[PDB]
Amino acid sequence: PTLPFHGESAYRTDYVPKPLPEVAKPVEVKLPPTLPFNAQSCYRSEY
Amino acid sequence: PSAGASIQAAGKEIDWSEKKLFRKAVVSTVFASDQVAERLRQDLP
C-alpha cells in the first residue's frame, strides 16, 4: 500500500513567523530643579 | 458597476504637513549629564 511522507522544507521549518519583540523602555527623564540667584554686586553691598 | 466599494490601493496620502527635520530621538544616559552637574553645584547629601 501507499505510505505518507514526512517531508519538510528546510526554509519552512526554521522560519515560522516569530512572535514580535515586546516593545519596552519608554523612559522619560526630568531635569534637576532651578536655583535662585543669591548674589550681590560690589555696588549693592558696599554702597 | 456597483462594485466600487473598495479601499484605494497604492497607499500614499501626499504629505500636506510639515516635513520632519527632527524625528523623535532617544536621549539617554551617555547624552544625559547629571552626576558632575550636582558635583559642580553641591546639592548637599
The closest of B37, B29, B20, B32 to A25, measured between CA atoms, is B29
C-beta pairs of B33-36 under 8 Å, 24+ apart in sequence: B34/A32
Resolution (A): 3.5
CB contact B21 to A (< 8 Å): no
Task: For residues A32 and B32, give the distance between their C-alpha atoms in angstroms, rounded to a whole number.
Answer: 12
Task: For residues A7 and A12, give the distance between their C-alpha atoms in angstroms, rounded to a whole number.
Answer: 11
Written as nine digits, the cell of B11 is 497607499
What is the dihedral sign for C-alpha B36, B39, B44, B45?
Answer: positive
Residues of chain A positioned with their CB less than 8 A from the CB of B43: 32
- The answer to whether the beta carbons of residues B38 and A32 sit under 8 Å apart is yes
CB contact B43 to A (< 8 Å): yes
Residue B37 identity: A
The closest of A22, A32, A29, A20 to B26, measured between CA atoms, is A29
Tally helices (H) and strands (E) across chain B.
0, 0
Is B32–A32 a contact, with Cβ atoms under 8 angstroms apart?
no
